Amino acid sequence: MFENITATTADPILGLADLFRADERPGKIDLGIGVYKDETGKTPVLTSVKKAEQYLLENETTKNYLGIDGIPEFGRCTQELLFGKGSALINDKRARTAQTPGGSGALRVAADFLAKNTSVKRVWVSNPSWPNHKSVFNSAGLEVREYAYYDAENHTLDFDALINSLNEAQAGDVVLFHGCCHNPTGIDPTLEQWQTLAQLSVEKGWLPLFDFAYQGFARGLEEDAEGLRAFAAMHKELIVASSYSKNFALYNERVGACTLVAADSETVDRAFGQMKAAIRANYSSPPAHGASVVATILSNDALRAIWEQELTDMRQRIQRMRQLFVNTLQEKGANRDFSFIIKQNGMFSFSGLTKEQVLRLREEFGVYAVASGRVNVAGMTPDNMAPLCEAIVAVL
Amino acid sequence: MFENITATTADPILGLADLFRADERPGKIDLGIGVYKDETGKTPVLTSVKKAEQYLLENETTKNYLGIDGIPEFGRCTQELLFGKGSALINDKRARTAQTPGGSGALRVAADFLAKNTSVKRVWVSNPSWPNHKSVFNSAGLEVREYAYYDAENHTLDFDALINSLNEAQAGDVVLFHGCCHNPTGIDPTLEQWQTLAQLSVEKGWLPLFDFAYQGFARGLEEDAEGLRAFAAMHKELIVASSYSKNFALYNERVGACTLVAADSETVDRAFGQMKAAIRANYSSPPAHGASVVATILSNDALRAIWEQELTDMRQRIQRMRQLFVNTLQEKGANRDFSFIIKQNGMFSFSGLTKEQVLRLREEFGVYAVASGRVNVAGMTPDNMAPLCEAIVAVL
């Protein structure tokens, strides 16, 4: 039964880990998978996280199964983060949250939920998006169509082209929005633009699906949720697939959430039963450790304040790396205007590098980026900035 | 559109948790979800696991993503547990292992892998079986049929009806076997019956899928794997979905493995690339904490020795509860002979209580079993045994 299975090439993003690890050159530089590095070039466990893990070690007395939807406190805390303390959606009990294995697991749960329980047939995704969006939705049995988003020559959001392409989206179609730190472009709608899309989404009867993996990495926790909240103020129905992988530096513990919003409590509760069914037929119930860490931190004032400073510290280091990157490219001999990189939000720079250029970077210089030209700015340090900029200039 | 979603019924197993919790009857007893309890009715963390978690807290320097297939040492240890050290399968590099979120996640990845990459259309499961088997395979669009298994009159394997009922299973159909501790009957094939099934499977061209959620709970680690190893000696291809939930008491950390075996290394590696694609489109990569604990224990001679004894301790307590259960039903005036319970393997008793009797146990006595009459013997205790048995005597 296995003899004729077709070979696959590895993931465009995740395939880099193996390639990177096998490389024997001491000067290799990993600018691939979106993980935060500190000034030492390491990916540390947060101080708040270690303290929470120490608490769990001494205080946990069981590994008994969580409910299919995970830790109740974790749900409450994520709804507050998403919608704002004292939001109508929380007061009116219009939202239900399943803790999931990462933002990824939350996307798949949402896709399975919609495919198996509604008339949804297709999902609209921005032209450049995270490459795994198509795979997740296709695997669930959904068609994916693209909408215009990025102007590659101007390195800007082409809002008019976005609106125009989305006129092909019908009522009952899903449209995927990145909550902030659009991946890979780093370009987000302004508040006014979010408000426009919210209005249009209502008019046209789309179902908004928010992928919210970087809350805290654009401007801040509350500010980064303004887009989602503008949608939430306007819609009866939406779904949010959120992640704590990046904002808690908890990548390998797989901590995310799928939040279902409906017109009222009766409707959301009934629908969430089917979401629970889709989880049950997948991984049964979610992993406790990472989510417990998150709930422990978010529900303790002192710990939360420590974590919030740590997240601010990550955001600010990336911003400093972004400026240093642009300044160093100039010193190393790049002719061209890279000022657009300063305007990008989040971990990445969508650099404009060619497939052949990124291949050269890997092969000749041991600098690893995604073939789309996506580079992880969060993986840049004062120590590796010179060599990576020399490498980029050498392939220009 | 969420108003169009149809009402679900709660899971027949996992649904018990909320119902049991909500019950206000003093002296209520939970015999539902299969978790081990000690003599005082707690579900403790193993001391081996606490020591492992201490080690991790001290030594972990990052939460950086695992690969799609998880921790390499975890995969190695898993294959040794499954097939035995120096197994031909391991030496010929015919097996590949992905760490997954539980045995549940392992079943799901097998299903997704099979549906997308093979001509498998049909999976045969036992009547009765764990109710989530059908759900997981159906999620991938695979037809699930039932084969005869249990002779409930005699409380044995109806082996003739088993053979007859699988007459119709075609070349390229999957047939699912429980490695040991059949859920819910507690009746396993003898080794001769395993060898008979292994031979028939080869003749008929089935693809065996072993669900191995209870290794160690029937007789011991190596003996419990005899059936699997009999199949493995005979087959070019098979899949194993295994779980460390019960044998490490690590339920909520979601610790499992999907192991793929093919005729040779070229084939398994090529097939496994597609298995990774199936994981990527689901939850991307597995949760580190539980699997690291398992790997830490199994790879350290001293820690592993501690764990092995803790496992045989659990097994011993369950066996004492089987005997106490039969004796106490006797003492409390049951006329139905429950001696058959003594010969059942694993955590459960398939008691032969009807759906009406189970409901009355719940409503009248606050005693919670699964509607199939499956009772968790591992949740029985010297203190709860007498009231539990008085309640059963009252409803028969």
* Residue spans per domain, chain A: 11-44+316-396, 45-315
Residues in chain A closer than 8 A to B63 (CB atoms): 43, 45, 49, 249-253
User: Closest partner residue to A280 among B11, B260, B284, by Cβ?
Assistant: B11
Judge: A135–B5 Cβ closer than 8 Å, yes or no.
no
Angle A333-A337-A339 from CA coordinates, rounded to 5°: 115
Instruction: Compute how many other C-beta atoms are within 10 angstroms of the C-beta atom of residue B317.
Output: 18
Alpha helices in A30-84 (DSSP H): 47-59, 72-83
Cβ proximity of B175 and B147 under 8 Å: yes
Q: B261 pairs with which residues across the strands?
A: B95, B238
Q: Distance (Å) from the C-alpha of residue B335 to the closest C-alpha of chain A?
A: 35
Name the β-bridge partners of B124. B145, B175
Return all residues near A115 (Cβ < 8 A) that are at least 6 apart.
Answer: A140, A141, A142
Q: How many helices (H) and strands (E) does chain B have?
A: 15, 13
Q: Which residues of B are annotated as a binding site?
A: 34, 130, 183, 374
Q: How does B157-181 read in b/e, with b if 16+ C-beta sit within 10 Å?
A: bbbeebeebbeebeeebbbbbbbbb
Helix (H) or strand (E) holding B6: none
Catalytic residue among A130, A194, A206, A307: A130
User: What are the residues whose beta carbons fall under 8 Å from the beta carbon of A77, sequence distance 6 or more?
Assistant: A294, A295, A298, A299
Of B248, B277, B3, B267, the C-alpha closest to B116 is B277
Point out the catalytic residue in the list B37, B51, B112, B130: B130
Q: Do the Cβ atoms of A211 and A241 come closer than 8 Å?
A: yes
Q: Residue B320 has which token pair?
A: 């004492």
Count of CB atoms situated within 10 Å of the CB of A306: 17
Residue reference for tokens 């970077």: A361
Kindly identify which residue of chain B lies nearest to residue A262, measuring between CA atoms. Answer: B2
Q: Catalytic: A130?
A: yes
CB atoms under 10 Å from CB of A160, counted, come to: 10
Q: Please give the full DSSP string across B343-363, using - where no structure is assigned.
A: G--SSEEE----HHHHHHHHH
Instruction: Tokens 């408000």: give the residue.
Output: A195
Task: Answer whether B100 sits within 8 Å of A283, measured CB to CB.
Answer: yes
Spatial CB neighbours of A225, under 8 Å, sequence gap ≥ 6: A81, A82, A83, A84, A179, A180, A212, A215
- State whether B288 and A252 contact (CB < 8 Å): yes
Nearest to A11 among B112, B237, B280 (CB): B280
Q: What is the dihedral of CA A38, A40, A41, A46, to 10 degrees?
A: -40
Q: Which two three-digit tokens encode residue B325?
A: 């259960």
- What is the three-class DSSP state of B123? strand
Cβ distance of A139 and B118 shorter than 8 Å: no
Lookup result for tokens 């199949």: B231
B100: nearest CA partner in chain A: A283
User: Which residues, 6 or more positions from A364, have their beta carbon under 8 angstroms from its beta carbon?
Assistant: A391, A394, A395
| CATH superfamily, with its number, for domain B11-44+316-396 | Aspartate Aminotransferase, domain 1 (3.90.1150.10)
Dihedral pair phi/psi, residue B196, rounded to 5°: -60, -45
The answer to whether the Cβ–Cβ distance between A139 and B116 falls below 8 Å is yes
- Secondary structure element (H or E) that encloses residue A364, with its range: helix A355-365
Question: Distance from first CA to last CA of chain A, Å, rounded?
Answer: 47
User: Which chain A residue has its CA at the smallest distance from B2's CA?
Assistant: A271
Nearest to B103 by CA among B241, B250, B251, B282: B241
- Topology agreement, domain A11-44+316-396 and domain A45-315: no
Question: In CATH, what is the architecture of A45-315?
Answer: 3-Layer(aba) Sandwich (3.40)
Q: Which segments of A are annotated as binding site?
A: 34, 130, 183, 374
Q: Note the residue count of chain B.
A: 396
- CA-based torsion, B225, B230, B234, B239: positive or negative: negative
B-chain CB neighbours of A62 within 8 Å are 42-45
| Closest alpha carbon to A123 in A228, A210, A229, A232 | A210
As annotated, the binding site of B for L-aspartate includes: 34, 130, 183, 374
Q: Are the C-beta atoms of B271 and B291 separated by less than 8 Å?
A: no
In this structure, the strands spanning A156-157 and A150-151 are antiparallel
CA distances from A100 to A254, A286, B170 (A): 7, 5, 37
Find the catalytic residue in A28, A124, A224, A246.
A246
Per DSSP, A237 falls in state: -
Rounded-to-integer distance, Cα A30 and Cα A32, Å:
6
Q: Could you tell me the two tokens for B394?
A: 């009252």
Cis status of the peptide bond prior to A184, with omega within 30 of 0: yes
- H-assigned helices in B16-168: 16-22, 47-59, 72-83, 88-91, 102-117, 132-139, 159-165
Interface test with A, best of B136, B272, B280, B294 (most A CBs within 10 A): B280
Whole-angstrom Cα distance, residue A289 to residue B294?
Answer: 14
User: What is the distance between the alpha carbons of residues B292 and A100, in angstroms, rounded to a whole number?
Assistant: 19
DSSP H/E element including B200: helix B191-204
Smallest Cβ–Cβ distance between B284 and the set A60, A66, A104 belongs to A104
Cβ neighbours of residue B223 closer than 8 Å, sequence gap 6 or more: none
**Chain A residues near residue B286 by CB distance under 8 angstroms:** 101, 254
- Which residue in A has a C-alpha nearest to residue B45's C-alpha? A62
Pairing assessment for the beta strands B29-30 and B367-368 based on DSSP bridges: parallel
Instruction: Report CB contact under 8 Å: A281, B250.
Output: no
Task: Report how far residue A151's alpha carbon sits from residue A159's, in angstroms, rounded to the nearest whole number.
Answer: 9
Helix ranges (H only) for A118-264 are: 132-140, 159-165, 191-204, 221-224, 226-234
Task: Give the span between the Cα atoms of B59 and B54, in whole angstroms.
Answer: 9
Distance CA B345, CA A247 (A): 46
Q: Do residues B71 and B292 make contact, with C-beta atoms less than 8 angstroms apart?
A: yes
Distance from CA of A290 to the nearest CA of B (A): 8
Tell me whether residues B139 and A112 touch, CB distance under 8 A: yes
Q: Which residue of B has its CA nearest to A132?
A: B281
Q: What is the C-alpha radius of gyration for chain B, rounded to an integer number of angstroms?
A: 21
Closest chain B residue to A255, measured at CA: B287
Query: Which tokens is B241 given?
Result: 């979905």
Q: How far is B304 from chain A (nearest CA, A)?
A: 19
Q: Is B246 among the residues known to form the active site?
A: yes
Considering A211, A224, A276, A307, which one is annotated as catalytic? A211
Chain-chain contact of A2 with B263 (C-beta, under 8 angstroms): yes
The Cα–Cα gap between A219 and A224 comes to 6
DSSP string, A76-105: HHHHHHHH-TT-HHHHTT-EEEEEESHHHH
Tell me how close the Cα of B102 comes to any Cα of chain A, in angstroms.
Answer: 7
Euclidean distance between the first and the last CA atom of chain B, given in angstroms as a whole number: 47
Out of A7, A262, A267, closest to residue B270 by CB: A7
**CA angle at A19 for the pair A15 and A20, rounded to the nearest 5°:** 110
- Which one of B64, B202, B292 would you mutate to disrupt binding with A, by most A Cβ within 10 Å of its Cβ? B64
CB-CB under 8 Å, B68 with A288: no
